[PDB]
Design a protein around this nucleic acid. Structure first.
Lengths: 125, 235
RNA sequence: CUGUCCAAUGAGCGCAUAGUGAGGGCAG
């Protein structure tokens, strides 16, 4: 189905799986901030690995400042289709429209993060 | 430069300075006229109504009810209570000079008030254009305050709600959103969590507004009603 | 613990406060 053109770049079903896995792992490793508000903070603070948003979010405008902050700070951002799905990957029973994987010292997740970053940088054209 | 918002921020501030001076003049005018008609202040609680009434009455209290312009200012019930209270007032006629200075400051005050209204209108109109949705939630005025401190609609949108609740703060942790009308129409007990709630929704409203969307305020309205419903729940 | 309502579109906290961030109400 169609998504708001503005939710760019949207992850296909494969990238979507990897993203949500890595988000789920980051929730476990405690490098995960959940909510548009807290994601904004991580960007202003300069501690964001990458940003993931729900193209489900209504009005979409409530998270559209993120790609702007991102572009400035040079942080990868991607979209997935479902905010309920993002919610679940963040440990939350509730929908989550944005979230941030934060930098962590000597992260085991480093290699996986680096890999996800590259994939997202590819979608940006 | 020359962003319109800074114009409106400063216009909105004038409004506060004029409110202050108007309050002071009212106090002055009440005190001065106290000798002519001491009981009136208790009868006409609204400052501007009181000043308009004083200007109308003047040195001669008798027959006040008969006046056709005073009927334009106060309710008939009130006109009748003051008229009856006039007939038994214990105050003496004023000197030509005290009457004349009283009239001079009454004129001053009404002129001030008209300009106050002219500015209030201007702020409303422009704010409804600069942040239609934000305005709808907290009013043009508060919206202009939080915009001024933030430095514009874009700098405001890049802020998290929790910092937007703190704007213009210095009992504790209350800023412009706390002192807003919408928040203040609640019993004190519910204000803190009410401020939190309004802040959150204003954060959403500002972001929509930074992208010039829902320019008719649909979002602002949804958000408002959504906020009012929870107000009802808590009651 | 269980049921239900609410809650990252922010629960709760409130001179970490330009902050905090997942929990709370009600019923057994």
């Amino acid at each position: 189905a169609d998504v708001n053109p503005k939710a760019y770049p949207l992850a296909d079903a494969h990238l979507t799986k990897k993203l949500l896995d890595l988000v789920q792992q980051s929730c476990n490793y405690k490098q995960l901030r959940k909510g548009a508000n807290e994601a904004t903070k991580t960007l202003n603070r300069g501690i964001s690995e990458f940003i993931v948003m729900a193209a489900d979010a209504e009005p979409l405008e409530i998270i559209l400042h993120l790609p702007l902050l991102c572009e400035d700070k040079n942080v990868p951002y991607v979209f997935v289709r479902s905010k309920q799905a993002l919610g679940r990957a963040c440990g939350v029973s509730r929908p989550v429209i944005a979230c941030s994987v934060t930098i962590k010292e000597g992260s085991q997740l480093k290699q996986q993060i680096q890999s996800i970053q590259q994939s997202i940088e590819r979608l940006l054209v | 430069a020359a962003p319109e918002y800074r114009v409106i921020v400063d216009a909105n501030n004038l409004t506060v300075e004029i409110e202050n001076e108007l309050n002071i003049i009212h106090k002055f005018i009440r005190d001065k006229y106290s000798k002519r008609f001491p009981e009136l202040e208790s009868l006409v609680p609204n400052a501007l109504d009181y000043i308009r009434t004083v200007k109308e009455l003047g040195n001669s209290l008798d027959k006040c009810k008969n006046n056709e312009n005073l009927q334009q200012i106060l309710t008939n019930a009130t006109i009748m209570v003051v008229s009856v209270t006039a007939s038994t007032t214990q105050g003496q006629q004023l000197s030509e000079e005290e009457l004349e200075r009283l009239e001079e400051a009454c004129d001053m005050a009404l002129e001030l008030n008209a300009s106050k209204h002219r500015i209030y209108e201007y702020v409303e109109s422009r704010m409804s254009f600069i942040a239609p949705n934000l305005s709808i939630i907290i009013g043009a005025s508060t919206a202009a305050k939080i915009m001024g401190v933030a430095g514009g609609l874009t700098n405001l949108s890049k802020m998290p709600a929790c910092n937007i609740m703190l704007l213009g703060a210095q009992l504790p942790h209350t800023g412009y959103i706390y002192h807003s009308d919408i928040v203040q129409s609640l019993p004190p007990d519910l204000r803190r969590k009410a401020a939190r709630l309004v802040a959150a929704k204003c954060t959403l409203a500002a972001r929509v507004d930074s992208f010039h969307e829902s320019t008719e305020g649909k979002v602002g309205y949804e958000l408002k009603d959504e906020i009012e419903r929870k107000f009802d729940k808590w009651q």
